[PDB]
Amino acid sequence: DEYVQELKGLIRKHEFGHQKVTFLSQSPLLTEGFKLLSSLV
């Protein structure tokens, strides 16, 4: 996991509080990322 950890510093440059937390605290990475993108847009 080389790009899994850096996201915890990338998304911080930003209310989807629960989704943001469950993204900061996690195979399911692509699914939650696409879910968060769809939710924000």
Partner: protein
């Protein structure tokens, strides 16, 4: 988007498909075919 400015919208999707490249078949192609601009691949 109108959340911060044009920074965590496309970079996050690009790194997500990059992670997919690093680690399905028809959906793995749908996720990249769906967003290049309108025509790129």
């Amino acid at each position: 988007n109108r959340f911060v400015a044009d920074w965590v919208i496309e970079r996050i999707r690009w790194l997500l498909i990059e992670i997919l490249k690093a680690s399905e078949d028809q959906e793995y192609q749908r996720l990249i075919h769906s967003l290049s601009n309108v025509k790129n691949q």
